[PDB]
Scaffold this motif. Sequence first.
Motif, mmCIF file in Angstrom:
data_model
loop_
_atom_site.group_PDB
_atom_site.id
_atom_site.type_symbol
_atom_site.label_atom_id
_atom_site.label_comp_id
_atom_site.label_asym_id
_atom_site.label_seq_id
_atom_site.Cartn_x
_atom_site.Cartn_y
_atom_site.Cartn_z
ATOM 1 N N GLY A 108 26.569 -38.732 13.307
ATOM 2 C CA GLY A 108 26.242 -40.073 13.754
ATOM 3 C C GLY A 108 25.380 -40.844 12.780
ATOM 4 N N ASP A 109 25.419 -40.500 11.495
ATOM 5 C CA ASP A 109 24.545 -41.142 10.509
ATOM 6 C C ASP A 109 25.331 -41.255 9.216
ATOM 7 N N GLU A 110 25.611 -42.496 8.806
ATOM 8 C CA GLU A 110 26.462 -42.768 7.655
ATOM 9 C C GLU A 110 25.863 -42.272 6.343
ATOM 10 N N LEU A 111 24.558 -41.995 6.313
ATOM 11 C CA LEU A 111 23.891 -41.523 5.102
ATOM 12 C C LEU A 111 24.150 -40.053 4.802
ATOM 13 N N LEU A 112 24.642 -39.288 5.773
ATOM 14 C CA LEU A 112 24.581 -37.834 5.761
ATOM 15 C C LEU A 112 25.957 -37.209 5.596
ATOM 16 N N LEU A 169 32.193 -31.627 6.146
ATOM 17 C CA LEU A 169 31.317 -32.260 7.128
ATOM 18 C C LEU A 169 31.013 -33.680 6.663
ATOM 19 N N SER A 170 31.553 -34.666 7.358
ATOM 20 C CA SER A 170 31.334 -36.056 6.993
ATOM 21 C C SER A 170 30.347 -36.696 7.967
ATOM 22 N N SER A 171 30.073 -37.978 7.737
ATOM 23 C CA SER A 171 29.008 -38.658 8.467
ATOM 24 C C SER A 171 29.251 -38.685 9.972
ATOM 25 N N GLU A 172 30.511 -38.691 10.421
ATOM 26 C CA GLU A 172 30.730 -38.795 11.863
ATOM 27 C C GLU A 172 30.293 -37.535 12.600
#
Length: 317
Positions: free
Chosen positions: A95-99, A89-92
């Motif tokens: 919708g949040d580049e931190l996560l 599970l990447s940031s996309e």
Amino acid sequence: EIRRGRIYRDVYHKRVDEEPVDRTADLERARLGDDGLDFQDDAAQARAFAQGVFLLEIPEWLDLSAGDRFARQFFQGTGVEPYGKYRDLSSEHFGDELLGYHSRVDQLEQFLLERRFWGEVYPSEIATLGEHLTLLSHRVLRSVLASAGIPEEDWHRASGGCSETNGSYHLTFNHYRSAHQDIGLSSHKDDGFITVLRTTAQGLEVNRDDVWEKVPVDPACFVVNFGLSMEILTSACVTPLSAIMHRVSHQNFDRSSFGHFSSSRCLPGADDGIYRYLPSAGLERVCGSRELIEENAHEIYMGTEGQGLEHHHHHHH
Ligand SMILES: C[C@@H](CCO)[C@@H]1NC(=O)[C@H](C[C@@](C)(O)CO)NC1=O
Ligand SMILES: O=C(O)CCC(=O)C(=O)O
Ligand SMILES: [Fe+2]
């Protein structure tokens, strides 16, 4: 006030201090029981808040077992049940580049998730853990705000909502890849107000004054950190509180941990900002909450500008 690569220039000497660590820190110990937040006496609480770090007894009712298992599994990939799939599970997805899953340039790899996603994305037992730590952290924060002399009318704005569980909360899982060279996690201060850290093995070091010291391993206690937002907020109060400089030493075998972080609300479209309290004039805005987070992330891993500070490197003498 927040300049990229310059946040830590005043503690640059701490960031480049690589002398061997032979001391263990004697942290103050508190509990959060039937009486609220409770140190041995007022002097102990004052020492703790001035150091920006203390130990907090883990309440008997709080179950950490699912968090400990998640911290040891999230990075393993979809092969490994029940938690290995979080590796993918990447940031996309958010919708949040931190996560999401992040492979850092230090030994650590992380899974970070903000509270608005816990119920939908985390396993229900992990979401439950996050909510329990939020209510625990909320109680700690209100005890600290009450001691700082900031009027209660101002707490919600001063805390970016954290005084009423309206801030931003990240439940973050850390795995230190011992096959990677160099530091486990570079020296830093956390972005926010309060961090609640669950550690079970050696590695965490703190620099409260002038020397790096090991945090003793106690799996019956949390480590509670104050972050940059707490330092900024109280920097002009009668008793300024410190954000604790801390790091994780190079790990020769794998290490896992997880933390709950409280910050001023930093949603991509609703940022509550970072304030300092002036006893005269009241609250004054310093920067954005997400702005602080991302400039901090830059400098933690990319380093602080060191020009003019070369005498702090031991090899130049
Ligand atoms: C807000 C969120 C950080 C989002 O980037 C929260 N705040 C922090 O300061 C730490 C910092 C580093 C060591 O963990 C991350 O590499 N971790 C968190 O989860
Ligand atoms: O793993 C640890 O003990 C420290 C984690 C930490 O400092 C952080 O993620 O901000
Ligand atoms: Fe940290």
